[PDB]
Write an enzyme that holds these catalytic residues in place. Structure first.
Site, PDB file in Angstrom:
ATOM      1  N   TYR A 129       0.856  -1.175   0.000  1.00 52.86           N
ATOM      2  CA  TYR A 129       0.000   0.000   0.000  1.00 52.86           C
ATOM      3  C   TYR A 129       0.898   1.232   0.000  1.00 52.86           C
ATOM      4  CZ  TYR A 129      -4.680   2.112   0.703  1.00 52.86           C
ATOM      5  OH  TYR A 129      -5.868   2.791   0.527  1.00 52.86           O
ATOM      6  N   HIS A 177      -4.322  -0.560  -2.554  1.00 58.48           N
ATOM      7  CA  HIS A 177      -5.497   0.298  -2.510  1.00 58.48           C
ATOM      8  C   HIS A 177      -6.691  -0.273  -3.279  1.00 58.48           C
ATOM      9  CE1 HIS A 177      -3.054   1.130  -6.010  1.00 58.48           C
ATOM     10  NE2 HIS A 177      -4.171   1.469  -6.627  1.00 58.48           N
ATOM     11  N   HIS A 181     -13.424  -3.628   1.199  1.00 59.10           N
ATOM     12  CA  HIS A 181     -13.714  -3.796   2.609  1.00 59.10           C
ATOM     13  C   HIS A 181     -14.596  -4.999   2.925  1.00 59.10           C
ATOM     14  CE1 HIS A 181     -15.069  -3.042   6.691  1.00 59.10           C
ATOM     15  NE2 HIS A 181     -16.293  -3.252   6.242  1.00 59.10           N
ATOM     16  N   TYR A 189      -4.286  -4.812   7.206  1.00 56.90           N
ATOM     17  CA  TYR A 189      -3.226  -3.874   6.845  1.00 56.90           C
ATOM     18  C   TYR A 189      -2.157  -4.002   7.935  1.00 56.90           C
ATOM     19  CZ  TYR A 189      -6.618  -1.443   3.806  1.00 56.90           C
ATOM     20  OH  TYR A 189      -7.573  -1.148   2.863  1.00 56.90           O
ATOM     21  N   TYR A 219     -11.591  -1.953   6.761  1.00 56.63           N
ATOM     22  CA  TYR A 219     -11.110  -0.568   6.599  1.00 56.63           C
ATOM     23  C   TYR A 219     -10.877   0.118   7.952  1.00 56.63           C
ATOM     24  CZ  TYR A 219     -11.651  -0.541   1.482  1.00 56.63           C
ATOM     25  OH  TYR A 219     -11.534  -0.778   0.129  1.00 56.63           O
TER      26      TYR A 219
END
Ligand SMILES: Nc1ncnc2c1ncn2[C@@H]1O[C@H](CSCC[C@H](N)C(=O)O)[C@@H](O)[C@H]1O
Lengths: 250, 10
Positions: A129, A177, A181, A189, A219
Protein backbone atom coordinates in the site's frame (compact mmCIF):
# COMPACT_ATOMS: atom_id res chain seq x y z
CA UNK A 1 31.45 -9.90 6.66
CA UNK A 2 27.93 -10.87 5.54
CA UNK A 3 25.22 -9.19 7.61
CA UNK A 4 21.52 -10.09 7.52
CA UNK A 5 19.03 -7.46 8.68
CA UNK A 6 15.51 -8.83 9.11
CA UNK A 7 12.65 -6.38 9.31
CA UNK A 8 9.71 -7.20 11.59
CA UNK A 9 7.61 -7.85 8.44
CA UNK A 10 9.86 -10.72 7.36
CA UNK A 11 11.77 -8.98 4.58
CA UNK A 12 15.53 -8.54 4.88
CA UNK A 13 18.65 -6.72 3.73
CA UNK A 14 21.70 -8.92 3.13
CA UNK A 15 25.27 -8.39 2.03
CA UNK A 16 28.88 -7.89 2.96
CA UNK A 17 29.30 -4.77 5.11
CA UNK A 18 31.91 -2.04 4.34
CA UNK A 19 35.08 -1.56 6.41
CA UNK A 20 32.73 0.64 8.51
CA UNK A 21 29.94 -1.93 8.95
CA UNK A 22 27.58 -0.21 6.48
CA UNK A 23 25.45 -1.99 3.85
CA UNK A 24 27.33 -0.51 0.91
CA UNK A 25 28.52 -2.50 -2.09
CA UNK A 26 27.59 -3.87 -5.52
CA UNK A 27 26.42 -7.26 -4.31
CA UNK A 28 23.85 -6.31 -1.67
CA UNK A 29 20.25 -7.52 -1.70
CA UNK A 30 16.80 -6.93 -0.38
CA UNK A 31 14.94 -10.18 0.11
CA UNK A 32 11.12 -10.24 0.27
CA UNK A 33 9.36 -12.13 3.13
CA UNK A 34 9.11 -15.27 1.00
CA UNK A 35 12.90 -15.61 1.54
CA UNK A 36 13.19 -16.20 -2.20
CA UNK A 37 12.43 -13.13 -4.28
CA UNK A 38 15.26 -10.65 -4.09
CA UNK A 39 16.45 -7.32 -5.48
CA UNK A 40 20.22 -7.71 -5.94
CA UNK A 41 22.79 -5.07 -6.85
CA UNK A 42 24.04 -1.66 -5.76
CA UNK A 43 23.08 -0.34 -2.32
CA UNK A 44 24.51 2.54 -0.30
CA UNK A 45 24.01 2.46 3.48
CA UNK A 46 21.05 0.07 3.08
CA UNK A 47 19.43 2.18 0.36
CA UNK A 48 18.68 0.49 -2.96
CA UNK A 49 20.42 2.23 -5.84
CA UNK A 50 20.11 -0.48 -8.53
CA UNK A 51 18.49 -3.77 -7.54
CA UNK A 52 17.91 -6.38 -10.24
CA UNK A 53 15.30 -9.11 -9.88
CA UNK A 54 16.91 -12.25 -8.45
CA UNK A 55 16.12 -15.49 -6.64
CA UNK A 56 17.81 -16.39 -3.36
CA UNK A 57 18.79 -20.04 -4.00
CA UNK A 58 20.87 -21.13 -1.04
CA UNK A 59 23.07 -19.79 1.74
CA UNK A 60 26.51 -21.08 2.69
CA UNK A 61 27.82 -20.17 6.15
CA UNK A 62 25.72 -16.98 6.13
CA UNK A 63 26.61 -16.14 2.52
CA UNK A 64 23.68 -16.09 0.10
CA UNK A 65 23.75 -17.26 -3.49
CA UNK A 66 21.51 -15.55 -6.01
CA UNK A 67 20.44 -16.32 -9.54
CA UNK A 68 19.86 -13.14 -11.59
CA UNK A 69 16.50 -13.34 -13.35
CA UNK A 70 15.99 -12.39 -17.01
CA UNK A 71 14.57 -9.03 -18.06
CA UNK A 72 16.03 -5.53 -17.72
CA UNK A 73 13.77 -3.98 -15.08
CA UNK A 74 15.81 -2.30 -12.37
CA UNK A 75 14.44 -1.02 -9.08
CA UNK A 76 15.65 1.78 -6.81
CA UNK A 77 14.64 3.60 -3.64
CA UNK A 78 11.90 5.85 -5.01
CA UNK A 79 9.92 7.40 -2.14
CA UNK A 80 6.73 9.20 -3.27
CA UNK A 81 6.47 13.07 -3.43
CA UNK A 82 3.56 15.55 -3.75
CA UNK A 83 4.35 16.02 -7.40
CA UNK A 84 5.19 12.32 -7.84
CA UNK A 85 3.68 9.09 -6.52
CA UNK A 86 6.41 7.16 -8.39
CA UNK A 87 9.07 7.79 -11.05
CA UNK A 88 7.91 4.62 -12.78
CA UNK A 89 4.18 4.36 -11.92
CA UNK A 90 3.64 1.51 -14.41
CA UNK A 91 6.57 -0.60 -13.22
CA UNK A 92 4.90 -3.25 -11.03
CA UNK A 93 6.31 -4.77 -7.87
CA UNK A 94 7.63 -8.25 -8.76
CA UNK A 95 6.73 -9.96 -5.46
CA UNK A 96 3.22 -8.53 -5.60
CA UNK A 97 2.96 -9.43 -9.30
CA UNK A 98 3.33 -13.13 -8.42
CA UNK A 99 0.65 -13.05 -5.71
CA UNK A 100 -2.19 -10.70 -6.78
CA UNK A 101 -4.27 -9.38 -9.66
CA UNK A 102 -6.96 -6.73 -10.16
CA UNK A 103 -10.36 -7.76 -11.50
CA UNK A 104 -14.04 -6.95 -10.99
CA UNK A 105 -14.98 -7.36 -7.33
CA UNK A 106 -17.32 -10.16 -6.22
CA UNK A 107 -18.83 -7.66 -3.79
CA UNK A 108 -21.97 -6.09 -5.24
CA UNK A 109 -21.31 -2.71 -6.95
CA UNK A 110 -17.92 -2.46 -5.20
CA UNK A 111 -16.02 -1.74 -8.43
CA UNK A 112 -12.65 -3.40 -8.94
CA UNK A 113 -11.14 -5.65 -6.29
CA UNK A 114 -7.84 -7.39 -5.50
CA UNK A 115 -7.50 -11.16 -5.97
CA UNK A 116 -5.00 -13.83 -5.07
CA UNK A 117 -3.16 -15.46 -7.95
CA UNK A 118 -2.01 -18.36 -5.81
CA UNK A 119 -2.81 -20.44 -2.72
CA UNK A 120 -1.16 -19.07 0.43
CA UNK A 121 -1.22 -19.74 4.15
CA UNK A 122 -1.96 -17.33 6.99
CA UNK A 123 0.46 -14.52 7.84
CA UNK A 124 1.44 -14.06 4.16
CA UNK A 125 2.30 -10.64 2.75
CA UNK A 126 0.43 -10.25 -0.55
CA UNK A 127 0.36 -6.62 -1.63
CA UNK A 128 1.83 -3.21 -0.84
CA UNK A 129 0.00 0.00 0.00
CA UNK A 130 2.26 2.75 -1.35
CA UNK A 131 0.99 6.26 -2.05
CA UNK A 132 1.57 9.96 -1.52
CA UNK A 133 2.08 11.09 2.06
CA UNK A 134 -0.26 13.71 3.52
CA UNK A 135 -1.65 14.89 6.87
CA UNK A 136 -4.70 13.75 8.79
CA UNK A 137 -5.85 17.39 8.85
CA UNK A 138 -6.01 17.85 5.12
CA UNK A 139 -7.90 14.55 4.91
CA UNK A 140 -10.41 15.50 7.67
CA UNK A 141 -10.94 18.87 5.98
CA UNK A 142 -11.96 17.42 2.61
CA UNK A 143 -14.92 15.60 1.04
CA UNK A 144 -15.18 11.82 1.28
CA UNK A 145 -15.14 11.70 -2.50
CA UNK A 146 -11.40 12.37 -2.04
CA UNK A 147 -10.86 9.97 0.90
CA UNK A 148 -11.62 6.53 -0.55
CA UNK A 149 -7.94 5.48 -0.49
CA UNK A 150 -6.56 7.29 2.55
CA UNK A 151 -4.86 4.94 5.01
CA UNK A 152 -3.37 6.01 8.32
CA UNK A 153 0.34 5.13 8.29
CA UNK A 154 1.42 6.49 11.66
CA UNK A 155 0.18 9.21 14.02
CA UNK A 156 1.53 11.92 11.71
CA UNK A 157 1.09 10.47 8.23
CA UNK A 158 -1.67 9.32 5.90
CA UNK A 159 -0.88 7.37 2.74
CA UNK A 160 -3.16 8.15 -0.21
CA UNK A 161 -3.64 7.02 -3.81
CA UNK A 162 -5.30 10.10 -5.34
CA UNK A 163 -6.92 10.36 -8.78
CA UNK A 164 -5.57 9.29 -11.57
CA UNK A 165 -3.34 6.79 -9.75
CA UNK A 166 -6.34 4.88 -8.35
CA UNK A 167 -6.59 3.49 -11.90
CA UNK A 168 -4.21 0.69 -12.99
CA UNK A 169 -3.86 2.39 -16.37
CA UNK A 170 -1.94 5.16 -14.55
CA UNK A 171 -0.39 3.44 -11.52
CA UNK A 172 0.39 -0.22 -10.86
CA UNK A 173 3.64 -0.06 -8.86
CA UNK A 174 1.60 -1.22 -5.84
CA UNK A 175 -1.94 -2.53 -5.65
CA UNK A 176 -2.93 -2.45 -1.97
CA UNK A 177 -5.50 0.30 -2.51
CA UNK A 178 -7.58 -2.05 -4.72
CA UNK A 179 -8.56 -4.38 -1.87
CA UNK A 180 -12.20 -3.91 -0.86
CA UNK A 181 -13.71 -3.80 2.61
CA UNK A 182 -15.25 -6.63 4.61
CA UNK A 183 -16.25 -7.02 8.26
CA UNK A 184 -15.13 -10.66 7.92
CA UNK A 185 -11.87 -10.00 6.04
CA UNK A 186 -9.23 -12.50 5.01
CA UNK A 187 -6.46 -9.88 5.29
CA UNK A 188 -5.21 -7.04 7.51
CA UNK A 189 -3.23 -3.87 6.84
CA UNK A 190 0.21 -4.32 8.47
CA UNK A 191 3.44 -2.30 8.63
CA UNK A 192 6.05 -2.88 5.97
CA UNK A 193 9.48 -1.50 5.15
CA UNK A 194 9.83 -1.51 1.35
CA UNK A 195 13.16 -0.99 -0.44
CA UNK A 196 11.49 0.99 -3.22
CA UNK A 197 8.58 2.71 -1.43
CA UNK A 198 10.05 3.15 2.06
CA UNK A 199 7.99 2.68 5.23
CA UNK A 200 4.42 1.94 4.13
CA UNK A 201 1.71 -0.62 4.92
CA UNK A 202 1.06 -4.00 3.28
CA UNK A 203 -1.81 -6.47 2.95
CA UNK A 204 -1.16 -9.65 4.94
CA UNK A 205 -3.47 -12.66 5.06
CA UNK A 206 -5.14 -13.56 8.35
CA UNK A 207 -5.98 -17.10 7.26
CA UNK A 208 -5.25 -19.46 4.40
CA UNK A 209 -6.41 -18.06 1.05
CA UNK A 210 -7.02 -19.99 -2.17
CA UNK A 211 -6.10 -19.03 -5.72
CA UNK A 212 -8.58 -16.57 -7.29
CA UNK A 213 -10.10 -15.70 -3.90
CA UNK A 214 -10.87 -11.98 -3.41
CA UNK A 215 -8.62 -10.27 -0.85
CA UNK A 216 -10.53 -8.16 1.63
CA UNK A 217 -9.56 -6.04 4.62
CA UNK A 218 -11.39 -4.28 7.45
CA UNK A 219 -11.11 -0.57 6.60
CA UNK A 220 -11.44 0.20 10.32
CA UNK A 221 -13.18 3.57 10.32
CA UNK A 222 -14.19 5.02 13.69
CA UNK A 223 -17.64 3.63 14.54
CA UNK A 224 -18.05 5.81 17.63
CA UNK A 225 -16.38 9.23 17.48
CA UNK A 226 -16.20 11.14 20.81
CA UNK A 227 -18.12 13.42 18.80
CA UNK A 228 -21.63 12.84 19.73
CA UNK A 229 -22.69 11.23 16.58
CA UNK A 230 -22.03 7.88 14.99
CA UNK A 231 -19.40 6.51 12.64
CA UNK A 232 -17.19 8.80 10.59
CA UNK A 233 -17.27 6.74 7.43
CA UNK A 234 -18.45 6.82 3.84
CA UNK A 235 -22.17 6.17 3.38
CA UNK A 236 -21.72 2.83 1.57
CA UNK A 237 -19.74 1.61 4.60
CA UNK A 238 -22.38 2.80 7.05
CA UNK A 239 -24.98 0.86 5.02
CA UNK A 240 -22.87 -2.33 5.04
CA UNK A 241 -22.29 -1.88 8.77
CA UNK A 242 -26.07 -1.78 9.34
CA UNK A 243 -26.59 -4.83 7.12
CA UNK A 244 -23.73 -6.77 8.71
CA UNK A 245 -24.93 -6.04 12.26
CA UNK A 246 -28.37 -7.33 11.21
CA UNK A 247 -26.69 -10.73 10.75
CA UNK A 248 -25.29 -10.36 14.25
CA UNK A 249 -28.24 -8.73 16.17
CA UNK A 250 -27.29 -5.56 17.94
CA UNK B 1 -10.10 10.47 11.20
CA UNK B 2 -11.27 10.20 7.58
CA UNK B 3 -9.02 7.23 6.85
CA UNK B 4 -8.52 3.73 7.25
CA UNK B 5 -7.14 2.23 10.49
CA UNK B 6 -7.61 5.62 12.11
CA UNK B 7 -6.11 6.00 15.60
CA UNK B 8 -8.51 5.73 18.48
CA UNK B 9 -9.12 8.44 21.07
CA UNK B 10 -8.93 7.61 24.79
N1 LIG C 1 -17.65 -3.56 0.90
C1 LIG C 1 -17.81 -2.62 -0.03
N2 LIG C 1 -19.05 -2.32 -0.50
C2 LIG C 1 -19.24 -1.36 -1.46
N3 LIG C 1 -18.14 -0.66 -1.97
C3 LIG C 1 -16.91 -0.94 -1.51
C4 LIG C 1 -16.71 -1.92 -0.54
N4 LIG C 1 -15.39 -1.99 -0.28
C5 LIG C 1 -14.75 -1.08 -1.07
N5 LIG C 1 -15.68 -0.42 -1.82
C6 LIG C 1 -15.41 0.64 -2.85
O1 LIG C 1 -14.01 0.71 -3.03
C7 LIG C 1 -13.52 2.00 -2.64
C8 LIG C 1 -12.24 1.82 -1.84
S1 LIG C 1 -10.82 1.57 -2.92
C9 LIG C 1 -11.07 -0.18 -3.33
C10 LIG C 1 -11.27 -0.49 -4.81
C11 LIG C 1 -12.50 0.06 -5.55
N6 LIG C 1 -13.62 -0.88 -5.69
C12 LIG C 1 -12.01 0.47 -6.94
O2 LIG C 1 -12.35 -0.11 -7.97
C13 LIG C 1 -14.64 2.70 -1.90
O3 LIG C 1 -14.73 4.10 -2.16
C14 LIG C 1 -15.89 2.01 -2.43
O4 LIG C 1 -16.43 2.69 -3.55
Amino acid sequence: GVCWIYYPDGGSLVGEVNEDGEMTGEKIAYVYPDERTALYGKFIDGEMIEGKLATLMSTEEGRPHFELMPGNSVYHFDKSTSSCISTNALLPDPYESERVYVAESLISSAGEGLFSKVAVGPNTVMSFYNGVRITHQEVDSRDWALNGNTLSLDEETVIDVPEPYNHVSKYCASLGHKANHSFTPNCIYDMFVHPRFGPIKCIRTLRAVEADEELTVAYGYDHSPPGKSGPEAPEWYQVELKAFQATQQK
Amino acid sequence: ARTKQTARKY
